[PDB]
Amino acid sequence: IVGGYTCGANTVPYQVSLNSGYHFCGGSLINSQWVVSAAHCYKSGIQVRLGEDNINVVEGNEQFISASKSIVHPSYNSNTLNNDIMLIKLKSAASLNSRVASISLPTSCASAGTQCLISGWGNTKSSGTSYPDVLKCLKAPILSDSSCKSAYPGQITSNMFCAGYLEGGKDSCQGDSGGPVVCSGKLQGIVSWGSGCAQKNKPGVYTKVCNYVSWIKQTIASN
Ligand SMILES: N=C(N)c1ccc(/C=N/NC(=O)c2cccnc2)cc1
Numbered sequence: 001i002v003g004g005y006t007c008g009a010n011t012v013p014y015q016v017s018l019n020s021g022y023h024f025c026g027g028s029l030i031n032s033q034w035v036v037s038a039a040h041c042y043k044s045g046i047q048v049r050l051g052e053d054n055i056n057v058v059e060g061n062e063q064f065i066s067a068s069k070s071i072v073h074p075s076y077n078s079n080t081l082n083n084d085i086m087l088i089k090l091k092s093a094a095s096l097n098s099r100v101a102s103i104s105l106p107t108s109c110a111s112a113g114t115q116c117l118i119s120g121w122g123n124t125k126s127s128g129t130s131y132p133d134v135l136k137c138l139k140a141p142i143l144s145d146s147s148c149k150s151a152y153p154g155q156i157t158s159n160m161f162c163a164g165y166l167e168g169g170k171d172s173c174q175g176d177s178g179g180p181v182v183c184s185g186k187l188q189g190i191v192s193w194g195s196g197c198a199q200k201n202k203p204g205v206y207t208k209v210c211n212y213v214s215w216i217k218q219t220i221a222s223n
């Protein structure tokens with residue numbers, strides 16, 4: 001997250017870190033056994049780390065649980081990033097409490113202008129490189145589909161939305177991938193892609209979660 005703020009320990013209780021010997025992606029806990037992330041975050045040997053603030057220090061509220069299975073969206077295209085969504089099942093159910101909690105799925109799509117909270121442990125610099133240890137947060141508006149498409153001609157599908165600031169300076173970045181965009185207590189987005197980070201006229205692009213609620217629910221119901 002570039003141009004954001006320190007969230008505060010466990011203030012984003014649905015935020016997960018995906019770990020394969022090191023943090024590599026974010027995700028969102030959606031019930032005691034399932035995490036939603038980006039398909040471009042797919043890999044084998046994932047350990048899901050819940051209750052994290054400092055990802056380099058054991059602070060007392062962590063739950064580390066190995067993934068038992070991952071399900072990349074049936075229609076994920078890694079070239080275009082269309083359908084950039086994946087489900088991860090935990091080997092054991094997380095113990096839910098105030099600091100480790102699920103986030104609600106949307107029942108309708110969010111509109112341009114809705115204010116959202118984007119979070120992660122990604123790069124904090126738009127030019128250089130600096131990775132934070134503690135969770136970073138950004139409040140950002142959803143942008144209109146027309147402005148999103150104008151920013152990225154030929155690249156925005158009906159399964160994507162832009163959020164952020166056309167002036168630049170405030171954005172998600174590398175390492176935030178797969179993490180949440182939460183608007184009025186609903187998971188509306190997943191950190192998906194962009195052109196660099198926090199660049200003028202290049203806002204973050206997010207997977208449009210409301211399009212996938214049917215698939216998420218039925219997938220969970222049979223797995
Ligand atoms: N919101 C943005 N502007 C944004 C969000 C996410 C990303 C994703 N970055 N990932 C990478 O660069 C990467 C990851 C693995 C290997 N080589 C490069 C970019 C911009």
Ligand SMILES: [Ca+2]
Pocket residue numbers: 052053054055056057058059062
């Ligand atoms: Ca920790």
